Scaffold this active site. Structure first.
Site, PDB file in Angstrom:
ATOM      1  CB  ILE B 155     -52.648  50.129  21.839  1.00 28.52           C
ATOM      2  CG1 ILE B 155     -52.793  48.630  21.534  1.00 28.52           C
ATOM      3  CG2 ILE B 155     -51.245  50.592  21.434  1.00 28.52           C
ATOM      4  CD1 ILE B 155     -53.029  48.306  20.079  1.00 28.52           C
ATOM      5  CG  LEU B 159     -49.026  49.108  25.379  1.00 28.94           C
ATOM      6  CD1 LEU B 159     -49.169  48.201  24.159  1.00 28.94           C
ATOM      7  CD2 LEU B 159     -47.992  48.573  26.368  1.00 28.94           C
ATOM      8  CD  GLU B 160     -48.434  54.106  21.406  1.00 30.87           C
ATOM      9  OE1 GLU B 160     -47.624  55.025  21.192  1.00 30.87           O
ATOM     10  OE2 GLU B 160     -48.187  52.920  21.128  1.00 30.87           O
ATOM     11  CB  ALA B 161     -50.344  56.456  28.626  1.00 26.14           C
TER      12      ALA B 161
END
Ligand SMILES: *[C@@H]1O[C@H](CO)[C@@H](O[C@@H]2O[C@H](CO)[C@@H](O)[C@H](O)[C@H]2NC(C)=O)[C@H](O)[C@H]1NC(C)=O
Ligand SMILES: OC[C@H]1O[C@@H](O[C@H]2[C@H](O)[C@@H](O)[C@H](O)O[C@@H]2CO)[C@H](O)[C@@H](O)[C@H]1O
Ligand SMILES: *[C@@H]1O[C@H](CO)[C@@H](O)[C@H](O)[C@H]1NC(C)=O
Lengths: 261, 247
Positions: B155, B159-161
């Site tokens: 994640i 996604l957080e990147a």
């Protein structure tokens, strides 16, 4: 939901050389001028923003004192702006009177400098950070081929080098006047060319000028709004050791940049 | 489907993957005064998922289902087994990985639900290519001992990147330095506040770019920085896209 429509907010305003917007000696009366002052927690540097398009300190509204350029910005009775459209603030931090189009300007960088309504030329002295955190943000600036910008040749020039963590000259202090300054020597600023024959970006003593105002855009570019252009790597080749000001183009990745703090 | 094999995992490739991931999530995105795309909302369940393929050192692949409305994993496929979160949209079962043996994992896709069930926080979970690859394996065989930790890793790295250039750049540094890192306060505070920053930044339209409430984004020296407006480079040149909040 009534959290999407917040009724007010109180905060500070910082700008040229990181000095704050300050009403002179906390004076109450109408037309009491506004100045640059070193930043602090005093009530007369607190600016409360409203859906009225007003910006209030000491229960009174920030305003220009004339339709012409060169007159002071003041505080006055908010009843006198009964059918006025007030202030508008651009993405880049240009605070503008909606009617006259005059812009908040600091014609010098020292304490007690009168702030005036002047014509917008997108200078650094006309750029402002609305927000309580008035400090310079110390950061590295990464660009093409994952390289860091570095101040070079006795803080006169600037180009890309490989990111070494400890390295002093790869760190840049981002000021509230949209300026990108050398962290170890904050008298100096990143500046576009003063010479018409060159498009080369260099480091110079800060002077509130158009050449030293820089916006970090959401689309990943470093924009100089005055000159309608962005920082670019020369020939998209980092080993040429030249960063230049260019018209925005998606041809290449030399105009793409990241802030890492 | 958009792919990231560990066999081709350079700084350039990683960046190209993350860049394309943003592009695909921001199709049909709305735009405010800040110029930072806002994700789609009220998306019919049939069009609500974006598929992404992640391959490990064995040339074995997991296909993850990313909810386009909030850039979180709803489920993933491995060979002919699929695995869903409990809080994944109820009708997702009938729309994605339909021709597989479907399972429901016993927890939600939030970091809090994952950290509770996994018994470990993000602060004690290293990140990097070596861990990226290990997490794909553990999700492919579905060893439940490692499933929670594998989501912490993936994640964050995917996604957080995509959400934050700072986090993207944390992973890029790791790729070129050849060295693992555990997320600091700077990273975690961006993950924590993505939802809140989306609200304040869209409400800010009302007050000429000024927030309803401040958000503390830590730096690499562990000093908090109050962000109470759109006029901070650490927000504006960092947050790539945002969750829909205000009309
Ligand atoms: C923005 O400036 C406009 C013009 O400079 C201001 O509107 C005028 O205000 C004066 C008082 O100084 C009134 O007597 C005039 O009738 C207004 N003239 C016009 C042109 O409308 C306005 O006060 C300023 N607003 C702010 C908030 O700065
Ligand atoms: O000099 C600008 C500075 O004034 C301070 O207020 C002073 C004021 O200068 C002085 O004339 C008066 O007699 O005493 C005041 C209180 O010390 C403000 O504190 C500061 O914000 C600036 O406006
Ligand atoms: C999962 O999400 C639901 C709401 O969608 C919530 O009620 C529940 O407490 C969450 N956590 C778990 C462990 O189910």
């Amino acid at each position: 939901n009534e959290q999407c429509s917040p009724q007010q907010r109180t905060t500070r305003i910082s700008g040229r050389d990181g000095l704050c917007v300050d009403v002179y000696g906390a004076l109450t009366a109408d037309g009491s001028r506004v100045i640059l002052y070193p930043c602090g927690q005093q009530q007369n540097q607190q600016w409360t923003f409203y859906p009225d398009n007003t910006i209030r300190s000491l229960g009174k509204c920030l305003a220009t004192s004339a339709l012409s350029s060169g007159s002071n910005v003041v505080i006055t009775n908010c009843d006198y702006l009964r059918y006025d459209d007030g202030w508008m603030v651009s993405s880049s931090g240009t605070m503008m009177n909606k009617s006259s189009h005059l812009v908040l300007t600091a014609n010098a960088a020292t304490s007690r400098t009168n702030l005036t309504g002047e014509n917008n030329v997108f200078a650094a002295k006309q750029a402002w950070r609305i927000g309580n955190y008035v400090e310079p943000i110390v950061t590295t600036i990464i660009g093409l081929r994952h390289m860091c910008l570095e101040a070079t040749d006795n803080d006169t020039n600037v180009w890309l080098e490989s990111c070494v963590k400890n390295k002093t000259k790869q760190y840049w202090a981002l000021y509230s006047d949209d300026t990108i300054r050398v962290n170890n020597n904050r008298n100096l600023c990143v500046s576009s060319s003063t010479d018409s024959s060159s498009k080369l970006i260099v480091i110079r003593r800060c002077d509130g000028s158009i050449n030293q105002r820089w916006v970090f855009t959401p689309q990943g570019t470093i924009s100089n709004p005055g000159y309608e252009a962005v920082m670019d790597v020369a020939q998209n080749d980092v080993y040429l050791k030249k960063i230049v000001l260019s018209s925005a183009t998606d041809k290449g990745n030399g105009q793409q940049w990241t802030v890492f703090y | 489907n958009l792919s990231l094999s560990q066999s081709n995992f350079s700084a350039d490739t990683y960046k190209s993957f993350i860049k394309n991931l943003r592009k695909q999530l921001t199709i049909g995105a709305s735009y405010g005064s800040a110029g930072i795309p806002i994700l789609k909302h009220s998306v019919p369940i049939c069009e609500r998922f974006l598929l992404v393929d992640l391959t490990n050192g064995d040339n074995e692949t997991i296909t993850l289902a990313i909810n386009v409305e909030d850039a979180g994993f709803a489920a993933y496929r491995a060979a002919d087994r699929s695995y869903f979160f409990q809080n994944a949209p109820p009708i997702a079962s009938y729309v994605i990985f339909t021709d597989t043996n479907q399972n429901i994992m016993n927890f939600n896709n939030t970091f809090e639900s994952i950290e509770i069930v996994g018994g470990t926080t993000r602060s004690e979970t290293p990140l990097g290519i070596m861990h990226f690859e290990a997490s794909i394996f553990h999700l492919f065989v579905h060893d439940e001992n490692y499933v929670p930790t594998s989501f912490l890793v993936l994640i964050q790295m995917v996604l957080e990147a995509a959400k934050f250039k700072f986090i993207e750049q944390k992973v890029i540094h790791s790729i070129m330095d050849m060295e693992d890192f555990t997320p600091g306060l700077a990273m975690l505070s961006l993950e924590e506040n993505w939802t809140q920053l989306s609200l304040q930044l869209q409400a800010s339209e009302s007050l000429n770019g000024v927030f309803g409430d401040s958000v503390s984004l830590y730096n690499s020296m562990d000093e908090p920085i109050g962000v109470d407006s759109m006029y901070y480079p650490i927000l504006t040149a960092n947050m790539a896209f945002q969750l829909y909040q205000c009309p």
